[PDB]
Amino acid sequence: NSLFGSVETWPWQVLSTGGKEDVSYEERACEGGKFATVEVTDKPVDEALREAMPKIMKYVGGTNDKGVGMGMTVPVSFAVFPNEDGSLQKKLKVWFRIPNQFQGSPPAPSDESVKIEEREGITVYSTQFGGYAKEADYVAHATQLRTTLEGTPATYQGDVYYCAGYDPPMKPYGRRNEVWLVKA
Numbered sequence: 354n355s356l357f358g359s360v361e362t363w364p365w366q367v368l369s370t371g372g373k374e375d376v377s378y379e380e381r382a383c384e385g386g387k388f389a390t391v392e393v394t395d396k397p398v399d400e401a402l403r404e405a406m407p408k409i410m411k412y413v414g415g416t417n418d419k420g421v422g423m424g425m426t427v428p429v430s431f432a433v434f435p436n437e438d439g440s441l442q443k444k445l446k447v448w449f450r451i452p453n454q455f456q457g458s459p460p461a462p463s464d465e466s467v468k469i470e471e472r473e474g475i476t477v478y479s480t481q482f483g484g485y486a487k488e489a490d491y492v493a494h495a496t497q498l499r500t501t502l503e504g505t506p507a508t509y510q511g512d513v514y515y516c517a518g519y520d521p522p523m524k525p526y527g528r529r530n531e532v533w534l535v536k537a
């Protein structure tokens with residue numbers, strides 16, 4: 354009897370790895386399906402997660418019409434929107450993917466802020482870094498990734514990208530954070 358055998362990995366396919374220098378990247382075709390999203394506006398990215406994420410964790414924790422736990426999917430991605438100077442607007446949207454055994458008919462969220470949405474599969478360029486991430490940290494690694502991708506046939510969107518986290522705020526050791534640039 355495993356306590357967290359319900360936590361599963363986001364299913365994607367590693368198409369290529371690159372960089373090999375100070376900045377490495379992975380090209381991933383990530384599967385779509387149903388998602389639980391929470392939109393937060395007029396709040397910094399650091400403070401948006403502190404309001405949005407507990408709504409997501411309560412949902413998969415039994416705050417749904419069936420009143421059942423659902424496990425979860427790691428990493429938990431959220432969308433940030435950069436200005437022309439690289440800084441992040443006060444807008445945020447969580448993109449938590451429903452576990453596979455609940456992709457068929459996701460339980461409906463009791464909190465109306467949590468919206469079950471559906472998205473198609475996307476391809477992302479991902480770079481990784483450790484520690485507890487802040488707004489300045491996501492920006493710096495997004496820029497270091499854009500720089501590495503410049504000079505290659507890579508093509509990515511510029512109005513939006515995603516940030517991913519693999520560990521709860523409690524787990525300090527060996528954390529993983531990623532920045533996903535959506536391919537176009």
Ligand code: HEM
Pocket residue numbers: 402403404406407410411413414425426427428429518519520521522
């Ligand atoms: C800063 C953002 C986060 C906040 C504020 C947060 C907050 C919480 C809260 C309030 C719960 C309890 C929910 C409930 O059952 O009522 C919880 C549970 C949990 N969180 Fe998070 N969390 C965050 C990010 C993460 C991340 C990134 C992960 C790892 C992917 C994670 C993993 C978990 C797990 C595994 C549970 C256990 C669920 C349960 O025991 O029912 N959390 N979190």
